[model samples]
Target: SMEQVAMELRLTELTRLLRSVLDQLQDKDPARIFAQPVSLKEVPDYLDHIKHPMDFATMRKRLEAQGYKNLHEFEEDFDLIIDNCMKYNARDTVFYRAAVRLRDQGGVVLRQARREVDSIG
Candidate 1:
């Protein structure tokens, strides 16, 4: 209907104006941006969260067998888990919390741990 088309046009124009204003604000005070933007990259397939506990246990066992002695030894595994969280969506908070726990446990350095969490998709 003509009304529907007009409504869509109006919404589109509103979106364009909103983006322009946001861009200006971003340019004016980039440091004020607290939250990072979400990435639009394709998410890879991953195991379900229902299986994460078991999988993490198995991962820990394997790491122990491999003589895991430091956070560096778990870097690749942590990266994989972070990738899986990204694929699952709505899991960044959990990921960040886990990273913070690791840092608190002296398992990972504060700076590197934060960088990993911040860069997740």
Candidate 2:
């Protein structure tokens, strides 16, 4: 039982460390919607939420068919409205909120595509 408790404590410490790192990254690059501070335990659910759209599969297929290399490159040019929203403190605007969501979704899609490509190489 003591060993189990120690393991749990270690896990908690690791999670907090990860969250701190995420927070620092977010602070440095506030435009990154995907870099919101979250623990490792929350990452899977967070990513799943971003990738939950029914049309994501269709969108990815279309992009691939168009000769796009990967989702990361595609998203680089995707043009979400929130790209500059933080600079103007547009958090209250509908466009800002939508952009946040769009950016997160794009992040998830691109991350998965990148992972797939990495696996092949």
Candidate 3:
């Protein structure tokens, strides 16, 4: 009975939202959408403070120095580039490299934190 209830609830939940999103996507032109380009120069504004902790404070300070006062502002700018790249630019390598760098940093931070915690107890 619980499984049946869950299945029904899942179907009820996804149908409306999926249809609405699909309706919007269907109206876009595929050719023009795929033809747009963005440069790496456009990346800094869109970047989040979510980089490596060693770089986080420095990145925030640099953004502030350049007059980007808050994270939300940076997010909005970054999202524009991200969305454009996701929709239009397919050949960019810098974003992928930055993502890998972030992933490596995350792994290092996690391992260091785990080591510190293990040493504590």
Candidate 4:
């Protein structure tokens, strides 16, 4: 009778939490800066600095495909966008400042959101 289940219940919960985080992260990105992949031609130096680039669009593709196994995996992809920016931009730059704000404030909310799932985990 239980030969197969399309997806586990825990996975369903996991996706919900992950989606919620992404939604809020986008909401915080008021400048539409991290909405898409960086332009390689525009910023050629990016390739030299960031080996692992991530963005909201790419995350959505992976999320819809159920590529995440846990909330941390989702968080890593989410956090990477900011860290990658920080890595490339100097600390005095606006881009670095924005990344710091998102990582600290939005990052806090994200971790808080995950606690609900963490408890049941």
Which residue pairs collide in model 2, if any?
A: none
Q: Give one digit per residue, the lDDT tens place, for model 3 in 8-42.
A: 55544433333332233223322222113332376
Query: TM-scores of all models?
Result: 0.29, 0.35, 0.25, 0.87
Q: Which stretches of candidate 1 lie over 4 Å from their true place?
A: 1-55, 67-73, 91-121
- Model 4, which residues run further than 4 Å from truth? 1-7
Residue 21 of model 2, lDDT score: 30
Ranking by TM-score: 4, 2, 1, 3
Ranked by TM-score, the better of candidates 2 and 4 is 4
Per residue, candidate 4 scores C-alpha lDDT tens digits across 1-121 of 2433535666777787778888988888888788999998888888788999999999999988778988778889988999898988899998888888788778677768778767878
Model 1 TM-score on a 0 to 1 scale: 0.29
**Ranking of predictions according to lDDT:** 4, 2, 1, 3
lDDT of each: 0.40, 0.43, 0.38, 0.84
Root-mean-square deviation (CA) per prediction: 19.5, 15.7, 19.0, 1.9
Candidate 4: what lDDT?
0.84
Question: Which ten residues in a row are the worst by lDDT in model 2?
Answer: 50-59
Model 4 worst lDDT window (10 residues) = 1-10
* Candidate 2 deviant stretches above 4 angstroms: 1-67, 79-89
Candidate that would win on TM-score: 4
TM-score of model number 4: 0.87
List of clashing residue pairs for candidate 4: none
